[PDB]
């Protein structure tokens, strides 16, 4: 009798598909034609941070857009001061791999995770000034892939065991567990309002989760490969996903369908990290060709390149004020473009 439920679900999927098509009157390329192209947006490395020993896996800009955290295989979680190239903290870590880090919006906390299955939370404001673990979040059965802070006490943690969580730092328990993905949840992103967050997994699907209801509101499955990275449009109505199929797709929330496909014949390698400018017109996407290709979001045109790294660009982040972009790469360097 399982085939009955299968065919019912298939009919529902057909309804979803033809509803989306009926809502698909045009394409974003048609709507944005008279708009002038951004032009040859050219960016050069203003500062380079060189303190890690092994590959850099992740980063996160601070809310003040001056302190950025970066985790590396060397067992370190370094908090650079991007204004003056100095360092502010260096966190020794129990696990060599740290495949995710996060910087709290209040600036009082940092995070780190990995195959250790534990989301550690380090408290920057300590009485001595030396930072140590404040809460070892455990309860996943898969590798922690991307963690983010809604506020100083709630943290969303995507993991490889096909779920996302909404840990309460004060209590340390899972308030809501977002299950439904059929693969390793590679990355997530929080909307500015910190009320709706999206995710991506090996199921080649992006799902909009809600922190206040714990339900998969929508599923934006349009990728041919594993979604490696995800972001949000600044307004909060769209989000661009980069996958291993060498394509970035800008899905939309109020339309439940993709709008453009940021792919070029020259680029064949998979995306690792994506981000938007403050306006949202420039989609800065890292790649495995060692370069970050700044695309024009409204026109799907390759605005520029950020070449200069000596290895795979593993993380990319744009300041909250949109001042400078910073990419951390496997060459054990992290450059602040602008």
């Amino acid at each position: 009798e399982l085939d009955q439920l299968r065919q019912e679900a298939e009919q529902l999927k057909n309804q979803i598909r033809d509803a989306r098509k009926a809502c698909a009157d045009a394409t974003l390329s048609q709507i944005t034609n008279n708009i002038d192209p951004v032009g040859r947006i050219q960016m050069r490395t203003r500062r380079t941070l060189r303190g890690h020993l092994a590959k850099i896996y992740a980063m996160h800009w601070g809310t003040d857009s001056r302190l950025l955290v970066s985790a590396s295989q060397d067992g370190k979680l370094i908090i650079w001061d991007s204004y003056t190239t100095n360092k502010v903290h260096a966190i020794p870590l129990r696990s060599s791999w740290v495949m995710t880090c996060a910087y709290a919006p209040s600036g009082n906390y940092v995070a780190c995770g990995g195959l250790d299955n534990i989301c550690s939370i380090y408290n920057l404001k300590t009485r001595e000034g030396n930072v140590r673990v404040s809460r070892e979040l455990a309860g996943h059965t898969g590798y922690l892939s991307c963690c983010r802070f809604l506020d100083d006490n709630q943290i969303v943690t995507s993991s490889g065991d096909t779920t996302c969580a909404l840990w309460d730092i004060e209590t340390g328990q899972q308030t809501t567990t977002f299950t439904g993905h059929t693969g390793d949840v590679m990355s997530l992103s929080l909307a500015p309002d910190t009320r709706l967050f999206v995710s991506g997994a090996c199921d080649a699907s992006a799902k909009l989760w809600d922190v206040r209801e714990g339900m998969c509101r929508q599923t934006f499955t349009g990728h041919e490969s594993d979604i490696n990275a995800i972001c949000f449009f600044p307004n909060g109505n769209a989000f661009a996903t980069g996958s291993d199929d060498a394509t970035c797709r800008l899905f939309d929330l109020r339309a439940d369908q993709e709008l453009m496909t940021y792919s070029h014949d020259n680029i064949i390698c998979g995306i690792t990290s994506v981000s938007f400018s403050k306006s949202g017109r420039l989609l800065l996407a890292g790649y495995d060709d060692f370069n970050c290709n700044v695309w024009d979001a409204l026109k799907a045109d390759r605005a520029g390149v950020l070449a200069g790294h000596d290895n795979r660009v593993s993380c990319l982040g744009v300041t909250d004020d949109g001042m400078a972009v910073a990419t951390g790469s496997w060459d054990s360097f992290l450059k602040i473009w602008n």
């Binding site: 339309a255 439940d256 306006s279 949202g280």
Partner: protein, 56 residues
């Protein structure tokens, strides 16, 4: 098995219940937001290096 399929069917119902809108309206909203906050993006319009904190 059965419970997973039932959950999936319910989830598809929930997804279908939303009120989808035209591509044109969403595209217009995105374009308007891009143009309105164009000045707020130093990455697009090159700000003078004096203001740029990351100046060489």
């Amino acid at each position: 098995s059965i419970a997973q399929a039932r959950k999936l069917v319910e989830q598809l119902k929930m997804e279908a219940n939303i009120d989808r809108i035209k591509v044109s309206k969403a595209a217009a909203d995105l374009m308007a937001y891009c143009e309105a906050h164009a000045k707020e993006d130093p990455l697009l319009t090159p700000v003078p290096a004096s203001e740029n904190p990351f100046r060489e």
